[PDB]
Design a protein around this ligand. Structure first.
Ligand SMILES: NC(=O)c1ccc[n+]([C@@H]2O[C@H](COP(=O)([O-])OP(=O)(O)OC[C@H]3O[C@@H](n4cnc5c(N)ncnc54)[C@H](O)[C@@H]3O)[C@@H](O)[C@H]2O)c1
Ligand SMILES: NC(=O)c1ccc[n+]([C@@H]2O[C@H](COP(=O)([O-])OP(=O)(O)OC[C@H]3O[C@@H](n4cnc5c(N)ncnc54)[C@H](O)[C@@H]3O)[C@@H](O)[C@H]2O)c1
Ligand SMILES: NC(=O)c1ccc[n+]([C@@H]2O[C@H](COP(=O)([O-])OP(=O)(O)OC[C@H]3O[C@@H](n4cnc5c(N)ncnc54)[C@H](O)[C@@H]3O)[C@@H](O)[C@H]2O)c1
Ligand SMILES: NC(=O)c1ccc[n+]([C@@H]2O[C@H](COP(=O)([O-])OP(=O)(O)OC[C@H]3O[C@@H](n4cnc5c(N)ncnc54)[C@H](O)[C@@H]3O)[C@@H](O)[C@H]2O)c1
Ligand SMILES: NC(=O)c1ccc[n+]([C@@H]2O[C@H](COP(=O)([O-])OP(=O)(O)OC[C@H]3O[C@@H](n4cnc5c(N)ncnc54)[C@H](O)[C@@H]3O)[C@@H](O)[C@H]2O)c1
Ligand SMILES: NC(=O)c1ccc[n+]([C@@H]2O[C@H](COP(=O)([O-])OP(=O)(O)OC[C@H]3O[C@@H](n4cnc5c(N)ncnc54)[C@H](O)[C@@H]3O)[C@@H](O)[C@H]2O)c1
Lengths: 167, 167, 167, 167, 167, 167
């Protein structure tokens, strides 16, 4: 039983982590697709795919989630929403369930015959990339919304410095 | 210490496996980039990125190589050889050494200031994608050139049937 | 005498139909280019090129307009407005007149030396893709703005279900 | 019952015509996809999609085949063979059977669950685009391999002049 | 000592000219990259790369700035901000300093290890492409914001006519 | 009177230089388009657009040809030969004559209504990119086929080292 989770992870936060945990309770393995892998250096998508790979790797690992239980696959976007599901399938291992709270993602996979599950929201109020960026720019408390290992990486790559320079 | 290996893995064979083993002897982790991830269904590149992801996953895992010691990242090709190194860097975690026997790959990374190591050849005669395909088409003994788990996947996806239909 | 009409047809409505009728009064044949053929599953452009092909086919046919009097050619968009006219010319048969109410379309074809005619508006108030979608989402009376055969197709492909899920 | 035929039609010849006729005997309508629509001005693919649209239109029409029995849809190629079937589906109306003598085309549609029929060859010896071009360049008798209306178009666009200048 | 200036030059105005002059005071040569070279016919980016090439050529030349002191290189945009610096480097001669008031441009080149200088603003209030277009559309006094030779070109290509038709 | 010359300049050799000289005898200015600007690091196209920009700049300049008499514009290739002429026009200043010995280039511009001149060959035997590369790889006398300033650049960028590593 292999599930699939698609997210930009800009950046990978506690919301993303709790849901990945819920999913690992009902699936043997989880394919984690880092979407919009070609985007970076924008307030909405500031980190590169590679940097996001490190964030998930350290977070999941520091959280005791075995490496053999997931796959981290960067996926660039394409112009045709109609071929997007096939695009994912071409780049990933087989999967039976799709987890997403994104309407377009859910609809596209539904039309394709896949069972789509919208995981429960875990403090959508504070645990959102929008909020994380919003706090970084306004000197708010962003570190609280992210796993410690994710904060460490953002520190090592000078994430905040980058984001502020862009705003 | 993190190294980087780039290969099409069409398909992942014993040659690829032994070298990955040699590299794991001098590096803590290895980033395995499945190149030409957008190519499939051709005699030269018959399997999709996703199918190749399964091949490496089962092989490495069946060979007792811990999941935490490597990253499997599919990478599509781009039109400019000049930006290809940056393209890899954007999609991967940081790395210190590059392993490749491909002249273009070696040169591009050299020009970029990376130390490039050309791993020793392990029976280049039989352990080559060219040979594997050559034997599949001519009913030769291809199973011997591939890890058992890789043969199993090729069986489950009907690889041989596909390749023959294409030739 | 062959004219050219360019439109997204998202979806094909009574406005599009009346104008196609006006044009067939002064031209032997009409080339109908379904623009933005690569877009789908968005509130602005919900249907695929193929689905739109069916809409026009059934509508025009049900309206007694002979098949030999028009060509339905899907056309994807390109990044350079400067080459867009050439892009259309490359994919279509020769034509003498261009019909459009779109400023960019008109200007581009003018600069290219083509006579451009802005057909008269037929109830632009209700006969607009914006309005059709607006009514589908708010349970309004959309069926009235579309040819019956177009409503039938939207029913057979579950258009409304899709659009609502996206909003 | 709607079938699908995919071909470059470089140019549309008697071979293509007879097979389209055979197919119309067992299907209500035929979707004719002009593949490699982005290619032109090469010995292998000398005519543009638009020019090929005219060739099929005049040929089929001059042969008494009603316009309502087919769709002519230009289709550009894409880099991923894995998404090519979806690419066609996105741009065309629904279809039940696929006709092709091309191994890749057949395999791709098979893997996708479509019944694929390889139509019988009608003088593959002389009725091939390779041969048509071969004769045009060497002043051979090419006109015999093509429908009269197709010869007329090639004359009106100066096809032979173009091809020779390229060789 | 070779510097690099990146700008859309939509259109090339007095602001762009004064800064190019300031830069020529501390650098032997200046590489002038006309960015977004693939964009044209939009209120934000109305002129083609070629038209912009003429604007800079006449302006700089009419201003007595020797041709041997600069390079005018059109540069199309790419989807990955992460490879954009490499993209510029691939298309230009070597350079030591980067001049820009654009946050993204500055940040990207900084991350890449280049010294970035934000030239002083010269009447940013009136000397902006936004303002030039704003005045052209509202019959304002745009000619005052542009070098005379630039006005002449805009006259010869019917710039104002184009822009108004688009708005 | 402005002419247009299109060439890959891989690398810029004495053949390219003499012809540029012949053209400057009958035209006020020459637009020199460095084609295939996206290609590099291949035996056929080893240098980047930027490196080629330096080659032409030093060569032309060292040959006393005033900078104001030419434009050096890098041009990436596109997939549709049908839009290629428009692609060039979009990126360059206006021009009246086209100079090329390339059949495709000549044909495309002819079809577009431009007068095309095939300049006389100047020792096509030795003055060809094929030959230059052929000699670099086989330790032949390549320096003789290139302007001195071009040899200097190839030395400063380690051209020979690169090419050999690729072969
Ligand atoms: N190229 C295409 O045509 C196409 C079509 C569809 C989608 N996409 C891609 O999909 C990606 C977008 O993913 P996204 O916007 O959903 O990313 P995201 O990171 O914002 O969301 C990822 C997942 O996290 C969940 N999540 C976030 N915060 C949560 C919280 N506090 N509690 C519980 N769950 C929470 C969301 O519900 C979602 O399932 C992009 O890369 C996009 O480009 C591409
Ligand atoms: N897009 C670009 O501009 C660009 C530029 C360069 C390279 N690339 C990509 O690089 C990839 C090509 O990789 P490749 O051709 O080397 O793949 P490959 O699978 O043939 O080789 C991968 C590695 O395996 C090693 N290897 C294979 N058999 C071996 C054996 N028996 N013993 C020891 N070592 C062995 C090779 O030396 C090499 O380092 C493609 O995806 C290509 O497109 C892309
Ligand atoms: N790729 C490029 O560079 C580029 C440049 C220009 C245009 N395009 C394409 O052009 C297409 C846009 O076409 P559009 O926005 O006009 O589509 P549309 O469907 O909104 O309009 C199509 C036509 O219908 C007419 N029309 C609509 N309702 C009418 C009514 N009630 N009465 C009378 N006439 C009515 C419009 O005036 C227009 O001529 C897109 O595919 C766009 O991407 C592409
Ligand atoms: N983009 C992608 O990934 C991808 C993948 C597969 C195919 N394609 C496209 O498919 C198209 C290729 O089609 P093709 O090469 O088959 O074109 P073609 O014109 O050579 O052949 C078209 C059809 O005509 C039939 N035919 C030709 N001569 C005949 C004769 N004398 N008697 C009977 N039948 C005859 C062939 O069997 C075939 O089914 C291209 O556009 C190609 O790019 C694209
Ligand atoms: N493709 C990518 O990923 C990517 C990433 C970054 C940037 N870009 C490109 O960079 C280009 C954008 O350049 P831009 O928006 O800065 O162009 P612009 O023409 O608006 O500005 C160019 C320069 O002029 C200066 N300037 C303008 N008016 C001035 C005045 N009155 N006084 C002093 N200085 C003045 C600006 O500070 C800037 O350095 C685009 O082509 C964009 O696409 C591309
Ligand atoms: N993207 C497209 O669709 C498309 C279509 C056509 C051409 N192109 C581009 O055109 C470029 C190809 O140019 P090319 O192959 O001619 O480059 P090239 O450098 O080989 O030749 C350039 C010019 O030099 C001349 N020349 C070379 N040696 C000479 C000598 N000894 N004496 C006299 N004249 C000599 C040739 O006749 C030619 O006019 C490429 O960038 C190609 O991609 C692109």
């Amino acid at each position: 039983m292999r599930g699939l989770l698609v997210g930009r992870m800009q950046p990978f936060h506690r919301g993303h982590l709790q849901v990945i945990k819920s999913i690992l309770e009902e699936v043997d393995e989880l394919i984690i697709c880092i979407g919009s892998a070609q985007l970076s250096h924008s307030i909405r998508d500031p980190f590169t795919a590679g940097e996001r790979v490190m964030m998930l790797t350290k977070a999941l690992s520091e959280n005791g989630i075995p490496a053999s239980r997931y796959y981290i696959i960067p996926v660039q976007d394409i112009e045709c929403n109609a071929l997007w599901v096939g695009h994912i399938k071409m780049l990933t291992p087989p999967f039976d369930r799709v987890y997403s709270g994104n309407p377009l993602v859910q609809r596209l996979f539904s039309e394709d015959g896949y069972e789509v599950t919208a995981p429960p929201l875990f403090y959508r109020d504070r645990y959102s990339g929008t909020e994380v960026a919003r706090r970084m720019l306004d000197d708010g408390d962003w570190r609280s919304l992210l796993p410690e290992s994710v904060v460490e990486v953002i520190d090592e790559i000078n994430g905040v410095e980058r984001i502020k320079h862009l705003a």
